[PDB]
Amino acid sequence: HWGYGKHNGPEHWHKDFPIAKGERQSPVDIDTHTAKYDPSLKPLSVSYDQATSLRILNNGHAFNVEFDDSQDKAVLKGGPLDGTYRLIQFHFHWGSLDGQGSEHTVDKKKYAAELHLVHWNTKYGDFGKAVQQPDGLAVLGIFLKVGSAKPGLQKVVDVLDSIKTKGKSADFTNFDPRGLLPESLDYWTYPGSLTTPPLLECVTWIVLKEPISVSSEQVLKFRKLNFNGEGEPEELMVDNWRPAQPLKNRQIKASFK
Ligand SMILES: CC(=O)Nc1nnc(S(N)(=O)=O)s1
Ligand SMILES: [Zn+2]
DSSP: OOOSSTTTSTTTGGGTOGGGGSSSOSOOEEOTTTOEEOTTOOOEEEEOTTOOEEEEEEOSSOEEEEEOOSSSSSEEEETTOOSOEEEEEEEEEEOSSTTOOOSSEETTBOOSEEEEEEEEEGGGSSHHHHTTSTTSEEEEEEEEEESSOOGGGHHHHHHGGGGOSTTOEEEOOSOOGGGGOOSOOOEEEEEEOOSSTTOOSOEEEEEESSOEEEOHHHHHHHTTOBSSOTTSOOOBOOOOOOOOOOOOSOOOEESOO
């Protein structure tokens, strides 16, 4: 019964998922002055030309856009990664106000939302096996700030009305995720976890330095979604973000000076 409420929120998760108090939990605050520039880090290789989106679903916590990951169609390579990682889904995290919504923070600064592009290491055969490994997933995090509209995001925004409640899904084909990327691919990277239960510590996080801009109207439509299922009391899907966790024995590395 976990969620983002006062009676089932992040502060409570540890009761069902003890790893919540683990050594490599996410998200975290990225202190730009203590981050270490690593010249050995290679540029990111994002190959989304052949991406095949299939649907969009409201899972009661966020909305996910799912892709066909039965072959190497949309993959992430390079950067701090060893091997090929396939894109399986993307989702966002957002707030009830423009001043909050992101999971990671930069020098304590919070963004309006955060986009997560989830990929799994193909050496493990399937997603379920990948999450059990320390190098099983790679999540690309992109911050969203409110300003000018993002044309490439409008297609997602327009279909939200069709998946307002938990459990609803809609066909969502031919969506090109390349339209959601910023101009630069400079990033920070650190070993972490999933930010929602089971909170497994199987993620190599890659957080882009350059945020993308979205309009107030676009983010407002995110806030119209529901955590609840149809026929149940309406609870607006807002503030579905986990606060920063202690860095502990970890070092954040930057690909840029
Ligand atoms: C099936 C799946 O993708 N689960 C995830 N759980 N948490 C994720 S996150 N918030 O770290 O990107 S992805
Ligand atoms: Zn996420």
